[PDB]
Amino acid sequence: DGLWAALTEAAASVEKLLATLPEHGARSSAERAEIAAAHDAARALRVRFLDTHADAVYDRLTDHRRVHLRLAELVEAAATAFPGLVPTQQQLAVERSLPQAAKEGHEIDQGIFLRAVLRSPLAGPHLLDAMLRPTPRALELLPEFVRTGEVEMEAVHLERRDGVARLTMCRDDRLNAEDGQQVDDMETAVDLALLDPGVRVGLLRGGVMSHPRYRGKRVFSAGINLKYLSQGGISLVDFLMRRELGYIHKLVRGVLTNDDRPGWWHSPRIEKPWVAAVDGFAIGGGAQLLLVFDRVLASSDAYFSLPAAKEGIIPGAANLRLGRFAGPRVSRQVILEGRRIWAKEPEARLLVDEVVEPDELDAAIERSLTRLDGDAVLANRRMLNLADESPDGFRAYMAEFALMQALRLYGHDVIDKVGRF
Amino acid sequence: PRALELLPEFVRTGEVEMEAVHLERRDGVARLTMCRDDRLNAEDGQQVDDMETAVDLALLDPGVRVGLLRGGVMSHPRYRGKRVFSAGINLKYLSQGGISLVDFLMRRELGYIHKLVRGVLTNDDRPGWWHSPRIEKPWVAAVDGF
Ligand SMILES: CC(C)(COP(=O)(O)OP(=O)(O)OC[C@H]1O[C@@H](n2cnc3c(N)ncnc32)[C@H](O)[C@@H]1OP(=O)(O)O)[C@@H](O)C(=O)NCCC(=O)NCCNC(=O)Cc1cc(O)cc(O)c1
């Protein structure tokens, strides 16, 4: 062994250099290379330690796979139980108060950690189940939602109507640009939709925009908030990983419930079909969402892009899912070269089921919702999703993604590009 | 007659600013920009007169080889900073009685639009008129917005 002691020392060297060296941006090139080498030695040992000890580390935190912990709770418990393995809440607060260009990149350690956890065939599936459980916030709001049929959240408006959970993304000043709060609202709303027995089908649509160039027009998504990303407010764990393992995965697989109802022995998760309706455009994170719906409609003037081909972060699980929809040539055109796909071109039918003129779209959305009601759709979409995306495939991708995306979140090309927005 | 009047200054200057159209000779191209920035280039009697005048100038100017029709940058708030080709006839003026059967609807078809196809019929005043009594040139259209 000896890896823990080596890691502890290498982390100490890093903290000693951060204490003595000048602040980021005031460092000379020799000072910059010295701290960079210390970060590298420490992170190298984080990997080597977890290569052999990940399962034991995870077992301590979750009582040998007997307590389900979500991502935030997991990395926070790992910080206190294994100092130096991942950053503390206090170290993260310091990072979070800095712009991305000035951060030391302590989230990378969380990427290292979550990679090793998701790579384990024992710990990985367990963490994924934990993220499929209902959020506490949703369980809290569920009784009022059952009664009222309505919840107004900061980034999402949810309404039960005619057996449909109508999620409207309503950040009318910024084209529904995504942030940590949008993810929390989306997961809460998705949780409510799935837990509400009066909901049979879900609908995701963008609301009416108010920014002057789009006033009176609906817009689906302009993707991640690039301003916040530049400013330090995009969290690796609480945004980039949370959305993939939480609400987006619940759209596919449903919510894992307790053994508290009949039939749980054949359906431990409650899943329902989802419809997406795209107004204006779906960009980045919003386009990623479309790879997970049972039905996708778009207005005739809409387009779909994952535009950050030169200097962007990985487009979530698009790299996992797009090849299945579009094949390897088109997926590389979209992701490697930033090809934008328009709702009216033939290849839009790889991503969209129905393209409709603006004046006929509302009615076409309503028709689509009535077609997905039965028990037959539920069984069939479960079998399809199982065939389309294996547990191992999703897990193995999200394991590498945790580290690869962490690195991209701190890449100089990304920081530079995002600052110019 | 308006075009013949403006032709010498256009040959000299390479530029004419009209109410509904901006015309510029550049690199042998007659660049017609439809520039009613407040109403998405909605058409009226004056637009037709400007269009025909510009088309006439493009065809008569020996320094022009190819014509280009494009919409200019709009200033209306829903389209500010964006080019728009044409929103068609001015429906407000049509309601108000200001769309002329002869001077708009017939004039545009028999004048500038037909000159885009067939050119301008000139006098017998140049070599070759016996085989080409009309001067025609090729035209490019670039459609922004709609
Ligand atoms: C979409 C546009 C072409 C629209 O062009 P215009 O019609 O000229 O609109 P704008 O006036 O820019 O937009 C209106 C308004 O919203 C603001 N806006 C628009 N999009 C954004 C984003 N993405 N962030 C922040 N603010 C935004 C814009 O600044 C204006 O607000 P003011 O500054 O207050 O004037 C343009 O706004 C644009 O390029 N937006 C950014 C698109 C983009 O590159 N998004 C990021 C793509 N990358 C991801 O999503 C990455 C990602 C997301 C994920 O969810 C997960 C993951 O793993 C990775």
Curated annotation (Swiss-Prot), chain A:
The keyword Oxidoreductase applies. CDD domains: crotonase-like. The keyword Oxidoreductase applies. Disulfide bonds: none annotated. SUPFAM superfamilies: ClpP/crotonase. Keywords: Antibiotic biosynthesis, Oxidoreductase. One of its GO terms (molecular function) is identical protein binding. It holds the Pfam family ECH_1. Its EC number is 1.13.11.80. GO terms for biological process: antibiotic biosynthetic process; fatty acid beta-oxidation. Inhibited by DPA-S-(N-acetylcysteamine). Changing E244Q: Same affinity and catalytic efficiency compared to the wild-type. It catalyses: (3,5-dihydroxyphenyl)acetyl-CoA + O2 = 2-(3,5-dihydroxyphenyl)-2-oxoacetate + CoA + H(+). Substrate binds at residues 172, 178, 211-214, 222-227, 285, 314-316, 405. Changing R243K: Strong decrease of affinity and the catalytic efficiency compared to the wild-type. InterPro entries: ClpP/crotonase-like_dom_sf, DPA-CoA_Dioxygenase, Enoyl-CoA_hydra/iso. Belongs to the enoyl-CoA hydratase/isomerase family. Homohexamer; dimer of trimers. Involved in the biosynthesis of the nonproteinogenic amino acid monomer (S)-3,5-dihydroxyphenylglycine (Dpg) responsible of the production of vancomycin and teicoplanin antibiotics. Catalyzes the unusual conversion 3,5-dihydroxyphenylacetyl-CoA (DPA-CoA) to 3,5-dihydroxyphenylglyoxylate. DpgC performed a net four-electron oxidation of the benzylic carbon of DPA-CoA and the hydrolysis of the thioester bond to generate free CoA. DpgC has the ability to process a diverse range of substituted phenylacetyl-CoA substrates. This is (3,5-dihydroxyphenyl)acetyl-CoA 1,2-dioxygenase. The lineage of its organism: Bacteria, Bacillati, Actinomycetota, Actinomycetes, Kitasatosporales.
From Swiss-Prot, chain B:
Changing E43Q: Strong decrease of affinity and the catalytic efficiency compared to the wild-type. Signal peptide: none annotated. It comes from the Bacteria. Substrate binds at D37, E43, H76, P77, R78, Y79, A87, G88, I89, N90, L91, K92. Involved in the biosynthesis of the nonproteinogenic amino acid monomer (S)-3,5-dihydroxyphenylglycine (Dpg) responsible of the production of vancomycin and teicoplanin antibiotics. Catalyzes the unusual conversion 3,5-dihydroxyphenylacetyl-CoA (DPA-CoA) to 3,5-dihydroxyphenylglyoxylate. DpgC performed a net four-electron oxidation of the benzylic carbon of DPA-CoA and the hydrolysis of the thioester bond to generate free CoA. DpgC has the ability to process a diverse range of substituted phenylacetyl-CoA substrates. Homohexamer; dimer of trimers. Belongs to the enoyl-CoA hydratase/isomerase family. This is (3,5-dihydroxyphenyl)acetyl-CoA 1,2-dioxygenase. It comes from Streptomyces toyocaensis. The lineage of its organism: Bacteria, Bacillati, Actinomycetota, Actinomycetes, Kitasatosporales. The chain holds residues 147 to 292 of 438 of the full protein.
